[PDB]
Amino acid sequence: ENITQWNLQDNGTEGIQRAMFQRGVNRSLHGIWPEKICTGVPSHLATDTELKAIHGMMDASEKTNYTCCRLQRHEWNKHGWCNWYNIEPWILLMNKTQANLTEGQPLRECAVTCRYDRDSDLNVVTQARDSPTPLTGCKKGKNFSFAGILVQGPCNFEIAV
Ligand SMILES: *[C@@H]1O[C@H](CO)[C@@H](O[C@@H]2O[C@H](CO)[C@@H](O[C@@H]3O[C@H](CO[C@@H]4O[C@H](CO)[C@@H](O)[C@H](O)[C@@H]4O)[C@@H](O)[C@H](O[C@H]4O[C@H](CO)[C@@H](O)[C@H](O)[C@@H]4O)[C@@H]3O)[C@H](O)[C@H]2NC(C)=O)[C@H](O)[C@H]1NC(C)=O
Ligand SMILES: *[C@@H]1O[C@H](CO)[C@@H](O[C@@H]2O[C@H](CO)[C@@H](O[C@@H]3O[C@H](CO[C@@H]4O[C@H](CO)[C@@H](O)[C@H](O)[C@@H]4O)[C@@H](O)[C@H](O[C@H]4O[C@H](CO)[C@@H](O)[C@H](O)[C@@H]4O)[C@@H]3O)[C@H](O)[C@H]2NC(C)=O)[C@H](O)[C@H]1NC(C)=O
Ligand SMILES: *[C@@H]1O[C@H](CO)[C@@H](O[C@@H]2O[C@H](CO)[C@@H](O)[C@H](O)[C@H]2NC(C)=O)[C@H](O)[C@H]1NC(C)=O
Ligand SMILES: *[C@@H]1O[C@H](CO)[C@@H](O[C@@H]2O[C@H](CO)[C@@H](O)[C@H](O)[C@H]2NC(C)=O)[C@H](O)[C@H]1NC(C)=O
Ligand SMILES: O=c1ccn([C@@H]2O[C@H](COP(=O)(O)O)[C@@H](O)[C@H]2O)c(=O)[nH]1
Ligand SMILES: O=c1ccn([C@@H]2O[C@H](COP(=O)(O)O)[C@@H](O)[C@H]2O)c(=O)[nH]1
Ligand SMILES: *[C@@H]1O[C@H](CO)[C@@H](O)[C@H](O)[C@H]1NC(C)=O
């Protein structure tokens, strides 16, 4: 099964999370990851015109001012081509995932990486995914802030349940 992961806004974290805060973006798709990682010559080189059709996904690179298409192309190259075989169904899934993320807090949202904010005493979530996973930078016993939404645990749904 595919892991869907995304970035969340945080002015306290340099890079994409800061660029997101400035542009009023809450969630920005990082990738959709099957188990197979692509290696070798891609079956199609992704174009800027193709990658821009993933609406609302922000590049993690400062060089494009956090727009398009360094991260988008990296994702196609490392996780896309050998798994989707054709760019069209891949762009459509990526664009639809971002459209869903743009609507707000997803049904399943689990913290991946945090920046613990001493001032607010919160785990400000900087990256999240649709399934639970071991945490990075999340302070034990502290509540979680997912682009402004306060959650008591790492997920917004019970994982025992
Ligand atoms: C979003 O997040 C960013 C990053 O943390 C915040 O930006 C910081 O804001 C503070 C407060 O305005 C800045 O502090 C001031 O730094 C001055 C020196 O800055 C240097 O220059 C580079 C730019 O080339 C900075 O990026 C570096 O940080 C350098 O250190 C410093 O001179 C200044 O002091 C003066 O003001 C204070 C009061 O604010 C006085 O008490 C003091 O005596 C003196 O007069 C500040 O300390 C900080 O530099 C900014 N950081 C960055 C990386 O940009 C934003 O505030 C956050 N935005 C929101 C909306 O919350
Ligand atoms: C989770 O991630 C996996 C990838 O690991 C996704 O599965 C891929 O889904 C895409 C569709 O979104 C599939 O692409 C289509 O593949 C057709 C050929 O596939 C054959 O069948 C098996 C799978 O049962 C493959 O493994 C073989 O290699 C076979 O070749 C292909 O013909 C088709 O292209 C046609 O349509 C497109 C437009 O839709 C045209 O552009 C094109 O010219 C052509 O007419 C698609 O490329 C892909 O096969 C799937 N890969 C695997 C390994 O299963 C899941 O969908 C993801 N699921 C979720 C929920 O995220
Ligand atoms: C975007 O969100 C919609 C709505 O939650 C998802 O659509 C659901 O898909 C499942 C099957 O995967 C259906 O059983 C539901 O009926 C659908 N709901 C609606 C309201 O259409 C969709 O899968 C999401 N897309 C992606 C790519 O994440
Ligand atoms: C980004 O997320 C924040 C936090 O959930 C959203 O802000 C909420 O917006 C509603 C309606 O505007 C207010 O009633 C709430 O008080 C807000 N919550 C907080 C904590 O500020 C914001 O709307 C989202 N932005 C986008 C573009 O979807
Ligand atoms: O979508 C992204 C890509 C990168 N990073 C951050 O930027 C760091 C390094 O930049 P790079 O190795 O991707 O070039 C990553 O380890 C992570 O801390 C993100 O938060 N989101
Ligand atoms: O299945 C995956 C793929 C990637 N990552 C993490 O996401 C970041 C970038 O993945 P990538 O999209 O560049 O491959 C890396 O820190 C990597 O550890 C995962 O946790 N699981
Ligand atoms: C991409 O998603 C947007 C919503 O963010 C939607 O308006 C558009 O139709 C989608 N593009 C497609 C389906 O090619």
**Set 30, 50, 79, 109: catalytic member:** 79
* Ligand 3 neighbourhood includes 97 CB (under 6 angstroms): yes
Enumerate domains of the chain plus CATH numbers. 1-161 (3.90.730.10)
Token couple for 113: 């990486």
Ligand 2, CB cutoff 6 Å, lining residues = 2, 32, 34, 83-86, 88-89, 93
* Ligand 4 neighbourhood includes 26 CB (under 6 angstroms): yes
Please give the method by which this entry was determined. X-ray
Q: Which atom number of ligand 4 is nearest to the Cα of residue 102?
A: 28
**Set 44, 52, 78, 142: catalytic member:** 78
DSSP for the chain reads: --EEEEEE--TTSTTHHHHHHHTT--EEEEEEE-SPPP-SS-SSPPPHHHHHTSTTPPPS-GGGTS-SSHHHHHHIIIIIHHHHSSHHHHHHHHHHHHHHHHTSS-SS-EEEEEEEETTTTEEEEEEEESS----BSPPTT-EEEETTEEESSSBSS-S--
Task: Please give the C-alpha separations between residue 141 and each of 35, 62, 116, 129, 152, in angstroms, as whole numbers.
Answer: 32, 34, 11, 20, 9
* Ligand 6 neighbourhood includes 3 CB (under 6 angstroms): yes
Resolution of the structure in the document, Å? 2.2
